[PDB]
């Protein structure tokens, strides 16, 4: 488990080396209704279902069919012209009121970006001290190790 990240100042060759040894040990081991059916089929096939491309074109001196199609264009154009009246009445006040809401929504996210930033650096900060604590202790151990190694020889 133990591998000191901050203390071990470990080349790319060692990653490539260790990857090969890990690789060799891997060589050894080796709820909705009908809605979901049509939605998954639409996405898989990459084709959206065609809508009513009729109101836009039409034609004068048609028949009973275009008499309907004509009368459709009138009522929707009157609804359109009424739908543009209540927008222009308020105008830009309704738009800029929503623009202000979006600024309150945005700043909230970036506050959380900082809260995460601080606690993430704070955890790493605690790790750092641990790394330097033990890395010294390991240094102490190795020095003592080398002392015996030659001490035992010089006695013999």
């Amino acid at each position: 488990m133990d591998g000191l990240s901050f203390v071990d100042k470990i080349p790319d060759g060692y990653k490539n080396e260790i990857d090969q040894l890990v690789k060799k040990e891997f060589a050894n081991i080796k709820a909705d209704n009908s809605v979901s059916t049509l939605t998954n089929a639409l996405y898989t096939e990459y084709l959206k279902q065609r809508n009513n491309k009729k109101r836009r074109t039409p034609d004068f001196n048609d028949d009973d069919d275009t008499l309907f199609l004509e009368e459709y264009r009138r009522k929707y154009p009157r609804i359109d012209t009424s739908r543009y009246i209540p927008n222009e009445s308020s105008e830009v006040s309704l738009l800029g009121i929503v623009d202000s809401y979006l600024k309150h929504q945005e700043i909230v996210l970036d506050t959380l970006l900082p809260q995460t930033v601080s606690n993430q650096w704070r955890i790493n900060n605690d790790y750092i001290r641990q790394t330097c604590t033990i890395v010294e202790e390991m240094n102490i151990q190795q020095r003592k190790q080398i002392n015996d190694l030659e001490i035992y020889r010089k006695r013999l």
Partner: protein, 387 residues
């Protein structure tokens, strides 16, 4: 569609304008005449306070529910997207924690390897300072394959006939016409053979099936694994695109889930039968023979060395290197391992040689253990010998 006094279907639904609850005109009127009150809330109410009769006027008795239906289906869409995202991010936590901990654990090895290495040079620099010939034809001489019936009976393949012979009576029970591999079914009445491109299944002294380098009976007793120079194994029929070469031998592991196939390019390929996948390859000339031990964790392979594999570690723990020597056949009894080819040798698996026979003239093509290792059998390029 119910009154809130009797519980009947109201034919004249009138309502009190103090507590919203649709009663029937008869019952509410009888309650008001009894005591001037609303029956549900006990508030003040009179007869004139009640709104009687149906309401349809300037209204006329579709569209609005279609939008309601559009909402109801969306309500599911949102619920589904939530549970799909939870599992998405919750799995990403496992992915992230693993990848981090993997490369963390990877650095353990890099450190460990260099210290292990240091220990080597340090210490190194310091330390420095019966014989039956009549089973098959005399004019086309040679037995090329051997098996013993697991439940008792000898099976040989010849330089084109398959023969079943009884060691006790010294009689040939059957000469089967229709051979470099043979397998004896435990049922005693079924025998299998293969040759330079069929597998044949025999009873009746007859061939009952012709199925179109190695042949092995599955643990169930119901299926045969085969290998071929055509690069495929068969049970289904599969090859390795990547390896793409002749398979030289084939054996099931005793539990019947995995098997091994030797290759002409010196690999021992391990396969998962269920998944039909190549799960491991043991490297380290053409493979000639492989054998799984009944202990379930040893595999012996040959190609002039016999290499021993521990399947729990996937490591080569021992190699017996012979000299010119051809190892053609390997088999465990799991106490003993026999080899045959240039000659017959038997090793004790515990300490790795206990028997050595050189009676055959020319190549030994098969070796086998009688039950409890009470005898050994071998066949040669005409004799079948018992020891």
């Amino acid at each position: 569609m119910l009154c809130a006094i009797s519980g009947k279907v109201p034919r004249r639904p009138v309502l009190s304008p103090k507590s919203r609850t649709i009663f029937e005109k008869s019952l509410l009127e009888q309650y008001v005449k009894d005591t001037g009150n609303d029956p549900i809330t006990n508030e003040p109410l009179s007869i004139e306070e009640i709104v009687e009769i149906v309401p349809s006027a300037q209204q006329a008795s579709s569209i609005p529910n279609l939008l309601t239906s559009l909402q109801n289906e969306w309500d599911a869409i949102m619920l589904e997207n939530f549970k799909l995202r939870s599992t998405l991010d919750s799995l990403t936590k496992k992915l992230s924690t693993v990848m981090y901990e993997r490369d963390a654990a990877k650095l353990v090895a890099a450190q460990l390897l260099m210290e292990k290495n240091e220990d080597s040079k340090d210490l190194p620099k310091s330390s420095q300072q019966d014989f039956v010939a009549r089973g098959k034809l005399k004019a086309p001489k040679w037995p090329i394959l051997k098996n013993l019936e697991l439940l008792q009976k000898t099976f040989p393949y010849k330089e084109k006939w398959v023969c079943m012979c009884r060691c006790e009576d010294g009689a040939l029970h059957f000469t089967q016409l229709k051979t470099i591999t043979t397998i004896t079914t435990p049922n005693p009445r079924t025998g299998g053979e293969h040759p330079a491109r069929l597998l044949l299944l025999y009873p009746s002294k007859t061939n009952k099936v012709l199925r179109e380098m190695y042949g092995h009976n599955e643990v169930n007793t119901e299926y045969f694994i085969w290998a071929d120079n055509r690069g495929t194994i068969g049970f289904y029929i599969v090859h390795s695109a990547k390896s793409d070469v002749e398979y030289s031998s084939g054996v099931l592991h005793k539990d019947s889930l995995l098997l091994a196939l030797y290759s002409p390019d010196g690999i021992l390929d391990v396969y998962n039968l269920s998944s039909p996948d190549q799960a491991s390859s043991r490297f380290p000339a053409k493979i000639k023979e492989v054998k799984f031990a009944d202990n379930g964790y040893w595999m012996v392979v040959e190609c002039q060395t016999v290499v021993c594999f521990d399947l729990r570690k996937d490591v080569g723990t021992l190699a017996y290197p012979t000299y010119k020597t051809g190892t053609v056949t390997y088999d465990i009894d799991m106490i003993a391992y026999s080899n045959e080819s240039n000659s017959l040798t038997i090793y004790k698996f515990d300490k790795k040689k206990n028997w050595t026979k050189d009676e055959e003239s020319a190549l030994c093509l098969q070796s086998d253990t009688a039950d409890f290792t009470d005898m050994d059998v071998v066949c040669g390029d005409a004799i079948l010998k018992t020891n």
